[PDB]
Design a protein around this ligand. Sequence first.
Ligand code: CLA
Ligand code: CLA
Ligand code: CLA
Ligand code: CLA
Ligand code: LHG
Ligand code: DGA
Ligand code: BCR
Lengths: 31, 31, 35, 27, 38, 484, 238, 30, 30, 30, 44, 67
Amino acid sequence: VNILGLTATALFIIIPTSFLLILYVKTAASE
Amino acid sequence: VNILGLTATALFIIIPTSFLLILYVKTAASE
Amino acid sequence: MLTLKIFVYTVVTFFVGLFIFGFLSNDPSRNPGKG
Amino acid sequence: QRVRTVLDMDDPAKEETVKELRKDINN
Amino acid sequence: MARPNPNKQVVELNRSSLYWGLLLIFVLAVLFSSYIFN
Amino acid sequence: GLPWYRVHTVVINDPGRLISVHLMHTALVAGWAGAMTLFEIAVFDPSDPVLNPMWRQGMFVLPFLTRLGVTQSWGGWTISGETSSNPGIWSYEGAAASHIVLSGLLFLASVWHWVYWDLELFRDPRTGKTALDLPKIFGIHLFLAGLLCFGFGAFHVTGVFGPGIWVSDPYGLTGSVQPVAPSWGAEGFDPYNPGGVPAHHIAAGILGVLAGLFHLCVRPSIRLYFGLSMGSIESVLSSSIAAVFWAAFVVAGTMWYGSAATPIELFGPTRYQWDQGFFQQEIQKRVAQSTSEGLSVSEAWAKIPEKLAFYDYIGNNPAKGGLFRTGAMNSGDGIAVGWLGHASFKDQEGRELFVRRMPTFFETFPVVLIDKDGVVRADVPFRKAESKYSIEQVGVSVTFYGGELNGLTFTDPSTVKKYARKAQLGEIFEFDRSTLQSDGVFRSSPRGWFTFGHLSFALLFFFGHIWHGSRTIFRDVFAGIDED
Amino acid sequence: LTYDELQGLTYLQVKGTGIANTCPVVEQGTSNVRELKPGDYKLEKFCMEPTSFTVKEVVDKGREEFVKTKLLTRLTISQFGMNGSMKINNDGSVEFREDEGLDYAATTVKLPGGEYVPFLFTIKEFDGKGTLDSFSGDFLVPSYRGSTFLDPKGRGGATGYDNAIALPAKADADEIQRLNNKSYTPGKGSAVFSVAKVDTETGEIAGVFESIQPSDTEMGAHPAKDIKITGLWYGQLT
Amino acid sequence: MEALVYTFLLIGTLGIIFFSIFFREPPRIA
Amino acid sequence: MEALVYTFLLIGTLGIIFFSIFFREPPRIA
Amino acid sequence: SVTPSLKNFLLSLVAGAVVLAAIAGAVTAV
Amino acid sequence: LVDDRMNGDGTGLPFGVNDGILGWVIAGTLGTIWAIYFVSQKDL
Amino acid sequence: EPGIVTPLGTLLRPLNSEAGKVLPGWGTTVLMAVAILLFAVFLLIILEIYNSSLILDGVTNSWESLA
Ligand code: CLA
Ligand code: CLA
Ligand code: CLA
Ligand code: CLA
Ligand SMILES: CCCCCCCCCCCCCCCC(=O)OC[C@H](COP(=O)(O)OC[C@@H](O)CO)OC(=O)CCCCCCCCCCCCCCC
Ligand SMILES: CCCCCCCCCCCCCCCCCC(=O)OC[C@H](CO)OC(=O)CCCCCCCCCCCCCCCCC
Ligand SMILES: CC1=C(/C=C/C(C)=C/C=C/C(C)=C/C=C/C=C(C)/C=C/C=C(C)/C=C/C2=C(C)CCCC2(C)C)C(C)(C)CCC1
C-alpha cells in the first residue's frame, strides 16, 4: 500500500475537517 | 498518472467545494 | 419474452388511454381566464 | 491401524493435539 | 403540532471546539498514517 | 444550542421523523449490502473452488449469501465448481440488485415520512398530545418477529419451501446447501449440529408469537411503567442496545470458535482446529488407513485431498494475520497453485524426524526436526558454531509423496533447510506471488475480521447502553441538580 | 416442413419468419437407410443446419467439457447450396466430396461470463470416409478475417502499417506477434455425420451431424478454441 | 512519497497549535 | 478503478442536479 | 440419561437457590 | 434451431401483434380506462 | 388541531390509543420472576453445553457432530 493509503488519509483529513468547518462558520457568522 | 489522476481529481473537487460550502454557511447563518 | 410483450403492451396501452381520455375530459375549461 | 502409532506421529509435530489431550492418564 | 416542525434546533460548534476537532483529526491522522501506509 | 453530538436529539419527540430516519439508515444498510455484493462479484475469481476459495479471497458477505442458499451466479458459474444452467432471479447479483432497489424504495419512503410527519396516528386522542404506546408497539413487533422466525425455521431451512442451509462433512471437504431435519433432542443444542437451527427457529418463533399475543393482550403495571420508564424512548433505546451487543458478543464468539452456522469452507478454518491438530489428525488417520492394507507411503498420499492439506496450513489460520495487514490472504502470501506433497525427513541411520509445527502465537519459530520419541535430533542452528544438531551434521534428507513432487529426495542442506522451514508452517504448498504482488506476511480470515469488528462494536455498544440507561434513569437531572 | 412445399410458398409469407433458415425434413420413407440405391451419385441442394453451439472450456478444477453458450448474432447459422459427388457400394462404404457453395459462416457467440468467441463455422472440402451409418474425415478451415483486415491501428497481413505508429517508441518490443506478423494459418477440423430417413423415391437424405473445428485465433494472438457444433442436415441426390 | 505526506500532516498540526494559541476566542469576563 | 470514479462523480452530479431542482431557495413575492 | 455432569449441575442450581434464600433470610433478619 | 425465436418481425402483422392475448389486454385496458372516464362523468 | 388524516392512519388508530393505560399494582411480576429465572437457567444450560462444562449422552460439541 503506497497510494491507496494516501487516498484514505486525504479523505480522513478532509471530510470531518470540512464538516467541522461548516458548523464553525455557521456559528461564527451568527454574531 | 493512474492514481495521480485520483489525487489530482480529489483535491480539485475538495478545495472549491469546501471553500464554497464555508462561505455559503457564512451567508445562511445570518438569516 | 411473451410475458414481456404482454406487460409492455399493457403499460403503454394504460398510459395512452390515460392520455386520450384525459384530453377527452373537456380541456377547454382548464384555462384560468374567461373564455 | 492402531491409534498408538498416530499418537507417536502427532506427538513431535504438535503436542496440543486433542487425541493426546484426551484420555492420556495411562500415558 | 403545527405545519412547521416545533423541534427546530440550531447546531452550535464554537471556535474552541473547532480547535479540538481539528487537533483530534490531525493527531489521529499523524498516529494512524504510519499504519495505514504500512 | 444543540452541540454537534446532540443533533439527532431533534427527533426524540417526533415519531414520523423517527420513522423517516430509521428508514434512511435502513436504506443505507441495504444499499451497502447491494454495493458490497456487486463489488465482491466484480473482484471475485471463481477459478478455484478448492485451493482459492472465497475465504482465501477475503470475501465478506459472499459466505453469508452462500450460507443461506445463494450459490449460483448470473456469471454462469457455481461456487461448488459446477455450471449454472439457469440461476434464475435469486443469484448473487440478483440479491445485490434487489438490495439496491430496496434501498431506493426505502429512501423514497424516508423522504415521505420526513415530509408528512404530522400524522394524528402519532397523537393519542385522550389528550391530543403526541405519544407512542410502546408496550403495544413492542407486542406488534414481537408478534411479527415470531411469525418471521417461525416461517424461516419451518419453510426455508427445512426445505419444504426454501432451499435449506449449508451442510457439510466434519472436515469441510464437500460442502453444499441441503434441507436440514430439526433435532428436537439434546443434540439439537449441539452447536455444530445443523439440525439445531430449524428446531431453534421453530420453537423461538412459536414462543415469540405467544409472547407477542400476550403483549398485545395485557397492559403493563404501575410499578414497572414507572420503574423502567416504558413511556420513554431512551429506555427502549437503552434496552434494545443492550440486546444488540449481547447478540453481537454471542455471534462473535460463535464465529471465532466455529459452529454449524460458521462453515469452515466459507469462513476459513478456525485457530482451534490448527491448535488441536484437527486436519493433521485427519490426514494422518487417512494415511494410517490405506497404509495398513498395502499401497505404502510412496503412493496413497494422493488419496489425501488437496483441500485437506490446504486446511492443514497455518496461512489459513485466522489468528495469524495483523491489525493493519489489509486485504485478502492471496495478497498476503500469493495464490495457492498446488500441493507439494508431504515432506518426510530422515537422518543418516534412518529415523523419521518431523518438524515442530509453529504455534499460533509465534510468527518466527526456530526450526526443529524432532523424532518419534520426542527427542530433539536436528535443527537449523542460529549459532552454527559449536552446534550439535545442524542439518549437515545429522545428515537429514527430505522426501515428498502425493504432490507435484513425488518420490523426489533432496539431500543438500541448502534445500533441506528451506523445505523444513516450509514444513514448519504445516503442509507445504506453492504460491503464485506475481499475480497480485503479495508482500509475504500472513493475513486474517473473514471470520477473524468479523469477530474483531463485532467484539469492538460490542464493547462500544456496551458503553452506549450505559450512557443511554444513565440518561434514562436520570432524565430529570440531565440539566443539573435541583439545588433544594 | 418438407422440400415439396418449401418451394410451394412465396417469399412474402417466408420473409422475416425464419423459414429461410430451416432445412427441409423427409416425412416419407423409412429410417433403415440401407434401402438407398448404390452407385455413383451427384447430390445437389445439400443443406446444413446447427441445433447447438457450445465452446470447449478448460475448467478450473481440472475438468474439461463443452459448456453451452449464447448466440450473439441473429439467425444466420445455416449453410445452403452445397454440391459434390457420392458413391455408394454394396457393403456400404461411402466417400464424401464437397467442392463449392455457401461454405462459411462467421458467427460470434457469448460464453457465460461475458466472453465472446468468434468463429467461422465451415464444412468446406470435407472428405467423409466410412459407412452410411457414420463417416468422418477432415475439412478445410479458414481463419476468419481476410488478409487485408484492419485492426484499430491499421496493420494486418495484406494491407496495414505493420506497426502501431501512434507510439514513436512501441515499434521494437515484445509485441512481435501483435504488429510485425499476423498469423493466417488455416486450421483443420473434425466432422461426424450420420444418415437417417432416406427417401429412395426422390433420393432425399437427412440426419444429424457433428462439427469440431478451431475458432478464430485473432490474427497471431491468444490461442483459438475448439467448438462442438451439432445439428440437422438435408440433401437431395441428383 | 510517504515522507511528504508525513511532513504535511505535522506542519498542519503545528499550524493548528499556532492558530489555537494566537487566534483563540478571547474570554468575555462578562 | 477509473470506472468507479466516473460512476461515483457522475451520480453525484445528477444527485446535485436533483438537489438544485427540489431543495432550491424558494423565491419571495415581497 | 442423567449424566454425572448434569446431576452436579442440577445440584449446583439447587445450591444456588439455597444460597439465594439464605441471603434473603439474612437480609430480612436485619 | 440453436435457440427459440419469435419471428415477429416483418410480414405487416396487424398492430405488430402475433398473439391474440396482446390485443385482448390492449382492448381490456382501453375499455376499463374508458369505463372509469364514463362513470366519472357529469362533472366540472 | 388534527394532523394529516389518512385511511392507513385511521386503520392503525386503535393500535396506538392507550398511551399510558396500565394495570394497577405489580401486575404479573411473579411471572417476571418465573420467566426470567427459567431463561437464566436455560441460558446457563446452553453455556455449559457449549463450554463443555456439562456433558450429555447425545452431544459431542465438536466438528464431528457433523458426522
Ligand atoms: C443503534 C445505537 C444508538 C442509537 C440509536 C443512539 C442514539 C443517540 N445517541 Mg448514542 N451511542 C451509541 C449508540 C447509539 N446511540 C454507542 C454505541 C455509543 C458509544 C460510542 C454512544 C455514545 C453516545 C454519546 C456520548 C452520546 C450519544 C448521544 C445520542 C443521541 C444523539 C446522537 C447525535 O446526534 O450525535 C451526533 C453524531 C454525529 C455528529 C456523528 C458522530 C461521528 C462518529 C463518531 C463517526 C461516524 C460513524 C460512521 C458514519 C458510521 C459508523 C457507525 C456504525 C459502524 C455503527 C441519540 C438519540 C448523545 C446524547 O446523549 O444525547 C444527549 C451523546 O452525548 N451516544
Ligand atoms: C425481507 C427483506 C430482506 C431479505 C429477503 C433479505 C435477504 C438477505 N440479506 Mg438483507 N437486509 C434487509 C432486508 C432483507 N434482506 C434490510 C431492510 C436491510 C437493511 C437493514 C438489510 C441489510 C442486509 C445486510 C447488511 C446484509 C444483508 C444480507 C442478506 C443475505 C443473507 C442474510 C444473512 O446474512 O443471514 C443472517 C441474518 C441474521 C443472522 C439476522 C439475525 C436476526 C437476529 C438474530 C434477531 C434477534 C433479535 C430479535 C428481535 C429477537 C426475537 C425474539 C423472539 C422471541 C421472537 C440475504 C439474501 C447480507 C449479505 O450477504 O449481503 C447481501 C448482509 O451482509 N442484508
Ligand atoms: C465490521 C464489518 C466489516 C468486516 C468484518 C470487513 C472485513 C473485510 N473487508 Mg470490508 N468493508 C466494510 C466492512 C467490513 N469489512 C464496509 C462497511 C465497507 C464500505 C466502506 C468495506 C469495504 C471494503 C473494501 C473495498 C474491501 C474490504 C475488504 C475486506 C477484507 C480485507 C481485510 C480488511 O478489511 O482490511 C483491513 C481492515 C482494517 C485495517 C481495519 C482498520 C482498523 C480501524 C477501523 C482503524 C481505526 C480508524 C482510524 C481512526 C482512522 C484513521 C486512519 C487515517 C489516518 C486514514 C476483510 C475480510 C477488502 C477485500 O478483501 O475485498 C473484498 C476490500 O478491498 N472492505
Ligand atoms: C457494567 C454492567 C451494567 C450496568 C452498570 C448496567 C446498568 C443498567 N442496566 Mg444493564 N445489562 C448489562 C450490564 C449492565 N447494566 C448486561 C451485560 C446485560 C446483558 C446484555 C444487560 C441488560 C440490560 C437490560 C435488558 C436492561 C438493562 C437495564 C439497565 C439499567 C437499569 C438498572 C438495572 O436493572 O441494571 C441491570 C441489572 C443487572 C446487570 C444485574 C444482572 C446480574 C445478574 C442478576 C446476576 C447473574 C449471575 C448468574 C449466577 C449468572 C452467572 C453464570 C456464570 C457462568 C457467568 C441500568 C442503567 C434496563 C433498562 O431499562 O435500561 C435503562 C434494561 O432494560 N440492562
Ligand atoms: C462517513 C463518515 C463521516 C465522518 C464524520 C466524522 C465526524 C467527526 C467528529 C470528530 C471531531 C469532532 C470533535 C469536536 C471537538 C469537540 O467535541 O469539542 C469539545 C466538546 C465541547 O462542546 P461544548 O460543551 O462547548 O458544546 C457547545 C458547542 O459550542 C460545541 O458543540 O466536548 C467534547 O464533547 C467531546 C469530545 C472531547 C473533545 C476532545 C477531543 C480531542 C482530544 C484529543 C486531542 C489530540 C491530541 C492529544 C495529545 C496526544
Ligand atoms: C386491438 C384491440 C383494441 C381495438 C383497437 C380499436 C378500438 C376501436 C376504437 C373505436 C372507438 C370509436 C370512437 C368513439 C369513442 C371515442 C370518443 C369517446 O369516448 O366518446 C365518449 C362518448 C360519451 O358519451 O361515448 C361515445 O361516443 C360512444 C362510443 C362508445 C365506445 C365504443 C364502445 C366499445 C365497447 C366497450 C368494450 C366492452 C369493453 C370491455 C373491456 C373493459 C375491461 C374488462
Ligand atoms: C433513487 C432511487 C433508486 C435508486 C437507489 C440507489 C442507487 C440507492 C443506493 C445506494 C448505495 C449504493 C449505497 C451504498 C452505500 C454504502 C454505505 C452507506 C457504506 C458504508 C460504511 C460505513 C458506515 C463505514 C464506516 C467505517 C469506516 C469509515 C471505515 C471502517 C470503519 C468503520 C466501520 C467505522 C431506485 C431507482 C432503485 C428506486 C427509486 C429511487
